[PDB]
Amino acid sequence: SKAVPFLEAPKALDGSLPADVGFDPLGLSDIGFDFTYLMVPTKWDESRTGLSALKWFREAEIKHGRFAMLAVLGWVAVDMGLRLPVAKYAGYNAVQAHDVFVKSGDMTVGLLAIGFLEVVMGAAIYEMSKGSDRAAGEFSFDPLGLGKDPSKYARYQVSEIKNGRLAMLAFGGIATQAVLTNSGF
Amino acid sequence: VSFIKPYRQDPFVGHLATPITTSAFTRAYLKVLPAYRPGLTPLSRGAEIGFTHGYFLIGPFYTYGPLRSVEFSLTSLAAGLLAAITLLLILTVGLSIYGQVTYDVYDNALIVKLVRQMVGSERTQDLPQIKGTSELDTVLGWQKFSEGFFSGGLIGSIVAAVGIALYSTYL
Amino acid sequence: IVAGHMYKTNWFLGHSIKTILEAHKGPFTGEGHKGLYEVLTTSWHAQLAINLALFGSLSIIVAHHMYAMPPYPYI
Amino acid sequence: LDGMIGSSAPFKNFDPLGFAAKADQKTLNKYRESELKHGRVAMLAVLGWIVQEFWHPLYDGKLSSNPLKALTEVPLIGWAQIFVAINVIEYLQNKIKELPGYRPGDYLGTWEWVEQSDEGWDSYQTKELNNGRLAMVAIAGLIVQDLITGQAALEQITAGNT
Amino acid sequence: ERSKSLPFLMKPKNLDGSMAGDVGFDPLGLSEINDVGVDLYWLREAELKHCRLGMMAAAGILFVEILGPAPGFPAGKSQMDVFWKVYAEKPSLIGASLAAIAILEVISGVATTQGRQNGDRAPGDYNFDPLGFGKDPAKFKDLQLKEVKNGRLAMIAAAGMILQGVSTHQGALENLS
Ligand code: CLA
Ligand code: CLA
Ligand SMILES: C/C(C=C=C1C(C)(C)C[C@H](O)C[C@@]1(C)O)=C/C=C/C(C)=C/C=C/C=C(C)/C=C/C=C(/C=C/[C@@]12O[C@]1(C)C[C@@H](O)CC2(C)C)CO
Ligand SMILES: CC(/C=C/C=C(C)/C=C/[C@@]12O[C@]1(C)C[C@@H](O)CC2(C)C)=C\C=C\C=C(C)\C=C\C=C(C)\C=C\[C@@]12O[C@]1(C)C[C@@H](O)CC2(C)C
Ligand SMILES: CC(/C=C/C=C(C)/C=C/[C@@]12O[C@]1(C)C[C@@H](O)CC2(C)C)=C\C=C\C=C(C)\C=C\C=C(C)\C=C\[C@@]12O[C@]1(C)C[C@@H](O)CC2(C)C
């Protein structure tokens, strides 16, 4: 491997996935369970060859990274003010805004909307398991167009996954610390 | 695996080799019983059977008889003992008449071979036929079996009465 | 309603009663329940036997639970 | 440590101290007999420990629910009958042991029907052996805990003496 | 091969291009259902009926809230609560409307099943063009697209109005401001 040199490799981390360095001490990328069956419990389709656990884990990692990046942006925003131009959003930090907004019937709306988007893109994941050429985390979302020049696309890929790992860990710290750089415990 | 098979590889017998008919536990348990224990004369088999049977027969008569006693009574024990002994006498009478009407043999495991070898052109059912080769299947064998049953029944009933008296008195 | 989503009818979802029965063999029971699905799908009398026996048992259970726990006002 | 039944996934042919690498077939049969008897007795002992703790209908209540205390409260004439019954059972087992084709722990005589054993039969025998081993460890722990602490299983757990 | 609406999804097999408003937005593959008497024909008929019903309901709510009720009818600006005021004083009107809608819906279901069986009637077609606004082709497709888009928007709008009236117990434009 290129990290943890005293372990050769998991088994499936050949390098076909971006941002691959070989770091997987527990060998989690070799579970034979096709996690698409957590969505569609049965084979359903006779053409459902199956999805490798590594590809499902890559999709989950990309989704986690995007969620964590947006989450740290939002949590940092509400520490330095920046409230929505509307009533009922006064100042109630981030450790308490979640509960008060769950009370005020709009976190349920956010849950519904996020679930709708998640269901559509999980249908995309299921089609990938069925055998579509779509790669993990690829929703073909390049509106501004900074995704051409394949070298730039690969660099931005590795950038997104590394930034997502950093943002996951940073959000874990921020939520655990209740923020120290911009507020108090 | 299958734990039920035809008995002794004969699919036409009215029997089966179940985990109860032909289990090792069944084999050993029935081979340690007096009726089938090897090395016992018919008198010994009868004596052991009578001892056990009188021993457990005195129980119900003494406990639930017409002369019970929640405390220990010599009259209750005597009544139970007499009832058990008379029941053993009735059983011995039944054994005697059964043996009288069933067998006509004095030495088995031979007559069968004699009539399978030296021919049996007679009235049959004594020379030929002969069900069972055990020593219990003879006139002499069953007579000694009944005698042993009767004597052992008396002795076992007396022993059980003594034990009941000791348990009721010293406990 | 939950129990009604058990047997496979028209989608790749649910159970096949044939596969359930045929898998319930044992050392003491030989082939087990193999062929019982064919018996109960080709004989009305077998279905009537099972249904009538369980139906009478259910009626007796109903009779017991009726007086045991009176379910109607002023009954 | 042979083709014997009882080898499971976590530690296949578990003989770290090499007790079986030098023993002959007779000693290994003795070891299997001892293991199976210990496992069965321990399963019975664990079940009795728990059930006695939360249910002792016999002896008109009394017979304190803590084991190792009811051990000294049974009339001691019921102890004799249990002892004699166990003795007669083991006499019958000894008589079984001389039957032809006897297998170490097989007192049902399954060798009469089971020639060319399957994988289900071996798996069930291994299940019995593993449950017996777990029950041996559990009953040893039960007795030791009750000795050192003085409380029974469900009593020590309920209080929180862990 | 990829759906026009969702580029990360393959083209839904049953939706080629024919129906107005078709952009390939079938992530769950509901167009491939062929059971319980439900297929693409039934789904399209249900969608068109929903579109028309939502358009009528949204237009009615907006009309009553903006221009007020007709003479002799109750007011209140809460369309989800004024229904009980109409029923409290004119129950016969509500009952007659319900009976008429029931008969028309029985006819609609019979027509849907028949047209599905002996294919001669497009889904949602009831030959209702009294003013001849869609006689010629090359305008019928545009009108179908307009109807489908307006009906989907009005479906969403009418569901929103129903939920707002049930929860807030206030008017639609009252909730707006
Ligand atoms: C993980 C993402 C995430 C989540 C869950 C939240 C959650 C919240 N934010 Mg928030 N925020 C985020 C990221 C996030 N933020 C980011 C990245 C920014 C910077 C741009 C902000 C800036 C921000 C401000 C300025 C304010 C909030 C506020 C709030 C709170 C009120 C909103 C509410 O009740 O739910 C409403 C429902 C949701 C938030 C669910 C999101 C559903 C979206 C809208 C669906 C569409 C997503 C979008 C299209 C994604 C595109 C990707 C793909 C389609 C291509 C709530 C706790 C307000 C507050 O009072 O907080 C204390 C407030 O004033 N946030
Ligand atoms: C090693 C096994 C073992 C031993 C030594 C004891 C010992 C004792 N038990 Mg006990 N018990 C056991 C297992 C055991 N138990 C199991 C497995 C159960 C669950 C059914 C119970 C349930 C139980 C209750 C409910 C009670 C006792 C009680 C008692 C005490 C009085 C004796 C009595 O009435 O027993 C009664 C025993 C039974 C009713 C069940 C025994 C069934 C045996 C163990 C199985 C068959 C044995 C068979 C003859 C030999 C196996 C054949 C083959 C494998 C070779 C005594 C300390 C009493 C007491 O005072 O509690 C404090 C009491 O009320 N036990
Ligand atoms: C078998 C069948 C028909 C058929 C067939 C045939 C005949 C065999 C022919 C074919 O061959 C096959 C088939 C299947 O088509 C089935 C019939 C259909 C059903 C089962 C009818 C259901 C209609 C229910 C509706 C549409 C009710 C809506 C309720 C509303 C309430 C309105 C409110 O204002 C109220 C009252 C209170 C207010 O506070 C607020 C709200 C809540 C908004 C909105 O409107
Ligand atoms: C532990 C953790 C991450 C641990 C990472 C580790 C050890 C990584 C170690 C390594 O990298 C190094 C060091 C070096 C590498 O070479 C080797 C490895 C091994 C790879 C994240 C926790 C992450 C923990 C998280 C994210 C917990 C979040 C909790 C939240 C957000 C709570 C939200 C609330 O809603 C509630 C629940 C209630 C509301 O009332 C209030 C609020 C607060 C709003
Ligand atoms: C069903 C109906 C009304 C139903 C109303 C109901 C149930 C309401 C009931 C309630 O309010 C009450 C009572 C009391 C409340 O407490 C309870 C409810 C339940 C709220 C009206 C039909 C009304 C039906 C009408 C008006 C029919 C008119 C028919 C015409 C003109 C026919 C003409 C033709 O027949 C010729 C002449 C020649 C033919 O060849 C051609 C044609 C054209 C077909």
XYZ file of C-alpha atoms in Angstrom, chain E residues 27-109:
83
model
C -36.951 7.739 -10.885
C -38.967 4.973 -9.201
C -39.912 3.316 -12.497
C -43.632 3.514 -11.750
C -44.411 3.594 -15.487
C -43.400 -0.086 -15.674
C -46.157 -1.247 -13.300
C -48.441 -3.745 -15.048
C -50.499 -5.135 -12.174
C -53.678 -4.500 -10.165
C -55.174 -3.019 -13.320
C -52.534 -0.271 -13.181
C -50.338 0.488 -16.185
C -49.070 3.529 -18.069
C -52.557 4.149 -19.471
C -54.158 4.112 -16.018
C -51.374 6.222 -14.512
C -51.701 8.802 -17.292
C -55.486 8.927 -16.910
C -55.079 9.410 -13.155
C -52.489 12.139 -13.744
C -54.769 13.972 -16.175
C -57.774 13.690 -13.853
C -55.616 15.006 -11.012
C -54.388 17.851 -13.226
C -57.921 18.898 -14.160
C -59.228 18.559 -10.596
C -56.332 20.575 -9.190
C -56.779 23.273 -11.825
C -60.482 23.571 -11.016
C -59.871 23.587 -7.253
C -57.070 26.167 -7.374
C -59.120 28.397 -9.670
C -62.101 28.092 -7.335
C -60.119 28.925 -4.205
C -58.432 31.913 -5.833
C -61.698 33.167 -7.356
C -63.662 32.917 -4.110
C -60.873 34.477 -2.055
C -60.184 37.379 -4.430
C -63.559 38.292 -5.943
C -65.592 37.079 -2.964
C -68.394 34.522 -2.856
C -71.462 34.517 -5.053
C -74.586 36.241 -3.688
C -76.410 34.197 -1.077
C -73.301 32.163 -0.214
C -71.262 32.266 3.018
C -68.014 34.179 3.426
C -64.993 33.745 5.683
C -62.031 33.538 3.261
C -61.102 30.075 4.635
C -62.094 27.723 1.829
C -61.445 24.588 3.897
C -63.830 25.859 6.597
C -66.457 27.627 4.470
C -67.447 24.218 3.077
C -69.070 23.293 6.387
C -70.940 26.607 6.372
C -72.321 25.832 2.910
C -73.255 22.300 3.982
C -74.877 23.662 7.149
C -77.316 25.734 5.062
C -77.400 24.090 1.596
C -76.794 20.360 2.142
C -78.831 19.458 -0.947
C -76.383 21.295 -3.212
C -73.444 19.335 -1.784
C -75.334 16.048 -2.033
C -76.416 16.643 -5.629
C -72.880 17.645 -6.602
C -71.513 14.501 -4.940
C -74.046 12.282 -6.723
C -73.286 13.905 -10.082
C -69.539 13.513 -9.543
C -70.080 9.882 -8.524
C -72.022 9.095 -11.702
C -69.502 10.931 -13.885
C -66.645 9.079 -12.168
C -68.298 5.697 -12.730
C -68.611 6.651 -16.400
C -64.980 7.818 -16.403
C -63.736 4.533 -14.958
